Amino acid sequence: AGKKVLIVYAHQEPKSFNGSLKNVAVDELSRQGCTVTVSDLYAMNFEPRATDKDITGTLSNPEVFNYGVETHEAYKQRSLASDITDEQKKVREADLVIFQFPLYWFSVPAILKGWMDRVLCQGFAFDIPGFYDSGLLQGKLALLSVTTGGTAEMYTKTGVNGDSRYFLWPLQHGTLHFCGFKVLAPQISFAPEIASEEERKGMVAAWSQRLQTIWKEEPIPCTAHWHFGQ
Amino acid sequence: AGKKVLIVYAHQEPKSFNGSLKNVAVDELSRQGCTVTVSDLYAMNFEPRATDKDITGTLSNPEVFNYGVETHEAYKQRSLASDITDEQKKVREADLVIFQFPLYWFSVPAILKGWMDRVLCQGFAFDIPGFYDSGLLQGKLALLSVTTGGTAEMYTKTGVNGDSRYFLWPLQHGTLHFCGFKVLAPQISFAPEIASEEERKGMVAAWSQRLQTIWKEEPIPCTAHWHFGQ
Numbered sequence A, B: 001a002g003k004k005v006l007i008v009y010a011h012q013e014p015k016s017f018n019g020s021l022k023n024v025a026v027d028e029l030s031r032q033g034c035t036v037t038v039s040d041l042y043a044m045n046f047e048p049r050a051t052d053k054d055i056t057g058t059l060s061n062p063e064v065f066n067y068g069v070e071t072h073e074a075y076k077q078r079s080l081a082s083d084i085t086d087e088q089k090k091v092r093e094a095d096l097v098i099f100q101f102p103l104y105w106f107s108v109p110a111i112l113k114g115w116m117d118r119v120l121c122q123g124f125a126f127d128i129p130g131f132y133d134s135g136l137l138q139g140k141l142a143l144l145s146v147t148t149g150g151t152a153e154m155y156t157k158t159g160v161n162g163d164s165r166y167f168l169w170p171l172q173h174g175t176l177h178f179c180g181f182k183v184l185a186p187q188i189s190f191a192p193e194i195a196s197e198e199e200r201k202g203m204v205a206a207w208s209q210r211l212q213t214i215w216k217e218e219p220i221p222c223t224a225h226w227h228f229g230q
């Protein structure tokens, strides 16, 4: 406060561990006096497909469809579909975007992948130039709050899954850094379903505590070295 | 000769460079006498979202929906939605699965992510235990055939994007090897929008040429070292 937060939330069940994490984030950020908005993608039936329906009116080139060029032209000419533009208005206003999701195949669920693909379009989130340190959402913070089915030990460099930082790369680097975000340290809640009824409260109460001082945090160095190195 | 190939194809435009790559694969593998099937996800309006619509029977826990528990039970009972079981039959029959797509945010387009999320369910593609070298699709081969906006140089260890292998990890390892596939070396067709008409022709031809001998190939060692070094 005075800060705005967008929580993009991708879980089907409000009673889930993910739902609890989204709800404590709203509760704690609302208590601090921050402005809070939640894009509840499943409840919204959010469209994940990148298709020519994302441009309204008439196309730059209706013989050969190029999603990147069409949506770039459409963002410049204010003719993107209203579900996209609604989400761009949220992100444009936000000082922090928190993604809350269960890890699906070492990445985001498809409905959230579709939000990244369709809302983070050229002209809005990035351009030539304006990417990585210079991306168009520069100034803004982003944070992945991810839950996993695999344990922390599975997610080490010599573990069956590799270090968590390895799967973070396309999300933190290739997507958030790329668009300009400073990335806060991910919040990774390992294997909640196998944890006890408390312990899970440890993790929820722990995210609420972290959120108390989120605006004091320095963003990680979003480097190949941070992700893979020594 | 006597092999079955599934191509899971994710591009909106038949006239695109991805479209040319898919078509050359069909032409060359058809020429060789292989059995070929293509799942053209956008033309199928393939559903990417993981929702409770994917199970048609009585849920195990209708009070608190857990997509992974409900779909595992649905797969064992034969009560998954038919679009999913349609794709599982194609995968079960295939000896090789080629994924043909443009790189979206260092990953697959969300329509293809939802193919992975919904088709590769517990019981069918993996079980716990029954993953990585014990995954249920053991015996099968997979190959990612990717196109990029970024040049090969941008995709090297000291380029901006980092090495191309780094973005392959959640797909090759976290998804395909997790399900028991052996993974053939990726086909990466760099920056075809930047390339001349000639260089594009050569990249289509280079893919066709590689497919002539694809059944002679051995898979990669799908480890942390192969992807990251050290």
Ligand SMILES: Cc1cc2nc3c(=O)[nH]c(=O)nc-3n(C[C@H](O)[C@H](O)[C@H](O)COP(=O)(O)OP(=O)(O)OC[C@H]3O[C@@H](n4cnc5c(N)ncnc54)[C@H](O)[C@@H]3O)c2cc1C
Pocket: A011, A015, A016, A017, A018, A019, A020, A101, A102, A103, A104, A105, A106, A107, A147, A148, A149, A150, A151, A192, A193, A194, A197, A198, A200, A201, A204, B064, B066, B067, B068, B116, B117, B118, B174
């Ligand atoms: C398609 C698919 C792909 C996947 N791919 C991967 C992958 O690549 N890698 C991987 O590691 N995992 C993967 N998973 C597993 C997935 O990441 C986990 O199942 C998910 O992260 C668990 O979080 P949840 O909210 O769904 O858990 P929940 O099951 O909702 O949480 C566990 C328990 O906590 C309860 N709970 C709710 N709120 C609270 C609270 N206030 N305090 C205490 N308990 C609470 C729940 O109701 C439940 O009993 C995959 C799953 C699917 C379906």
Ligand SMILES: Cc1cc2nc3c(=O)[nH]c(=O)nc-3n(C[C@H](O)[C@H](O)[C@H](O)COP(=O)(O)OP(=O)(O)OC[C@H]3O[C@@H](n4cnc5c(N)ncnc54)[C@H](O)[C@@H]3O)c2cc1C
Pocket: A050, A066, A067, A068, A116, A117, A118, A174, B011, B015, B016, B017, B018, B019, B020, B101, B102, B103, B104, B105, B106, B107, B147, B148, B149, B150, B192, B193, B197, B200, B201, B204
């Ligand atoms: C949401 C989104 C996210 C993206 N994220 C990334 C990313 O993370 N990293 C990245 O590097 N890129 C990214 N891109 C760029 C994208 O990967 C490239 O635009 C795409 O890979 C290029 O493939 P295409 O088929 O669309 O090319 P096209 O534009 O179709 O192909 C280039 C040219 O080749 C022509 N062609 C077709 N067939 C032939 C043929 N037989 N012979 C000669 N020429 C032919 C086409 O007609 C066209 O003129 C992103 C794009 C979008 C829209």
Ligand SMILES: COc1cc(OC)c2c(c1)c(C)cc(=O)n2C
Pocket: A105, A106, A149, A150, A151, A154, A161, B068, B174, B175, B178
């Ligand atoms: C596809 O669904 C799942 C479910 C899981 O556990 C529930 C998984 C995974 C995938 C992967 C890729 C790694 C892992 O460690 N675990 C535990």
Ligand SMILES: COc1cc(OC)c2c(c1)c(C)cc(=O)n2C
Pocket: A068, A174, A175, A178, B105, B106, B148, B149, B150, B151, B154, B161
């Ligand atoms: C998000 O859309 C795009 C479009 C591109 O090029 C057309 C990109 C990228 C993303 C990324 C992340 C890296 C890159 O090198 N290129 C060239």
Ligand SMILES: [Zn+2]
Pocket: A172, A173, A174, A177, A178, A221, A222, A223, A224
């Ligand atoms: Zn980075």
Ligand SMILES: [Zn+2]
Pocket: B172, B173, B174, B177, B221, B222, B223
């Ligand atoms: Zn592997």
